[PDB]
C-alpha cells in the first residue's frame, strides 16, 4: 500500500511516503503553513501520483497548539478531496519509535515540552515491531512524572527532558533534543493501517 505521512507538531516539519519504497524529508524551522505543502509536492515527484495514495497519516499531537492544527487541516483537506482515510498517531509515540530506530531503545519515556511549565508525558515499550503506549498520555509538571516499569533500562526522548533535574527519576541515557520525525510516523502508520485503524477525513482531530 501507498501511505503519506505529515508532522508539524513541533519545531520540526516533516513528510514521508511509502509503492514499496520509503522516503523522508525533514527540516527544522519554526512558517509551517508555508513549507508543508511544498515538501509534499517535492516528495511525490522525486519518487508517484497523489491519487495513488491509499491513506494519510499525521501527528495528532500533543505539541504546538497551532502547529498540530495546521497539519490536521491540511490532512483534513487532502484526504477529503482524495476521498481516502486518515491515520491518527501520537507525537509522543513517534518520539518513542524514533529513539528505537536511532539508539535501539526498547523502553522509551517520551516527553515533549508543554505550556505553563509542564510536560506532555508518554511511556512506550517495544512490542513486536512497534513502540506501544504503556498506560496513558498526560500533561504533568515534571515532578509528578512517573514510569510504568521497574528501575531496568529505559530511555528518555524529547524536549520535556530539559526538565530532567526536576523529575523524580532519570534514565541511564536520554536525548533532550529529539523531535517527531515523519519516517517514524510512517512506521507507526504501517502497524495502524494493517490493523485497519483508518477513519474518515472529518474525524481527523488533535488530542486533548
Q: How far is the CB of 40 from Na ion (least distance, A)?
A: 30
Measured in residues, the chain has a length of 208
Give the closest residue to 95 by CA, choosing from 42, 143, 59, 144: 59
Interface residues with Na ion (CB under 5 A) are 113-114, 117
Q: State the binding partner of 36 from a second copy, Na ion, none, CB within 5 to 8 A by kind.
A: a second copy
Cell triple for 5: 505521512
Q: How far is the CB of 42 from a second copy (least distance, A)?
A: 11
Q: How far is the CB of 32 from a second copy (least distance, A)?
A: 9
Which lies closer to a second copy via its Cβ, residue 20 or residue 182? 182
Interface residues with a second copy (CB under 8 A) are 11, 27, 29-31, 33-34, 36-38, 40-41, 50, 65-66, 69-82, 113, 116-117, 123, 125, 132-137, 141-144, 146, 148-150, 152, 159-160, 162-163, 165-166, 168-169, 176-177, 201-203, 205-208
Using DSSP's 3-state secondary structure scheme, residue 128 falls into: coil
d(CA 175, CA 110): 10
Q: State the binding partner of 1 from a second copy, Na ion, none, CB within 5 to 8 A by kind.
A: none
Radius of gyration of the chain (CA): 16
Q: Quick one: CA torsion of 152, 153, 159, 165, rounded to 10 degrees?
A: 60
Q: How far is the CB of 51 from a second copy (least distance, A)?
A: 8
Reply yes or no: is the peptide bond before residue 62 cis, omega within 30 of 0.
yes
Q: How far is the CB of 9 from a second copy (least distance, A)?
A: 12
Bridge partners, residue 56, by sequence: 4, 86
d(CA 97, CA 101): 6
Cell triple for 162: 530539559
Q: State the binding partner of 5 from Na ion, a second copy, none, CB within 5 to 8 A by kind.
A: none
Which lies closer to Na ion via its Cβ, residue 58 or residue 161? 161
Which lies closer to a second copy via its Cβ, residue 79 or residue 185? 79
Cell triple for 157: 526522548
Which lies closer to Na ion via its Cβ, residue 23 or residue 139? 139
Amino acid at each position: 500500500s501507498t501511505l503519506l505521512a505529515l508532522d508539524t507538531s513541533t519545531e520540526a516539519c516533516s513528510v514521508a511516503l511509502l509503492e514499496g519504497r520509503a522516503l523522508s524529508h525533514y527540516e527544522v524551522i519554526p512558517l509551517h503553513a508555508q513549507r508543508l505543502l511544498p515538501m509534499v509536492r517535492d516528495l511525490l515527484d522525486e519518487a508517484v501520483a497523489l491519487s495513488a495514495v491509499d491513506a494519510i497519516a499525521f501527528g495528532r499531537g500533543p505539541g504546538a497548539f497551532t502547529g498540530v492544527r495546521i497539519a490536521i487541516g491540511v490532512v483534513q483537506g487532502l484526504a477529503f478531496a482524495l476521498q481516502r482515510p486518515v491515520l491518527a498517531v501520537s507525537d509522543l509515540a513517534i518520539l518513542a519509535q524514533r529513539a528505537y530506530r536511532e539508539q535501539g531503545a526498547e523502553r522509551v519515556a517520551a516527553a515533549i515540552d508543554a505550556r505553563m511549565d509542564e510536560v506532555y508525558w508518554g511511556c512506550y515499550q517495544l512490542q513486536q515491531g512497534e513502540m506501544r503506549l504503556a498506560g496513558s498520555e498526560a500533561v504533568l509538571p515534571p515532578e509528578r512524572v512517573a514510569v510504568p516499569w521497574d528501575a531496568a533500562d529505559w530511555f528518555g526522548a524529547g524536549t520535556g527532558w530539559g526538565y530532567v533535574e526536576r523529575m523524580p527519576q532519570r534514565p541511564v541515557a536520554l536525548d533532550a533534543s529529539l523531535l517527531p520525525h515523519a519516517e517514524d510516523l510512517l512506521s507507526l502508520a504501517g502497524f495502524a493501517w494493517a490493523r485497519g485503524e483508518g477513519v474518515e477525513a472529518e474525524q481527523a482531530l488533535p488530542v486533548y
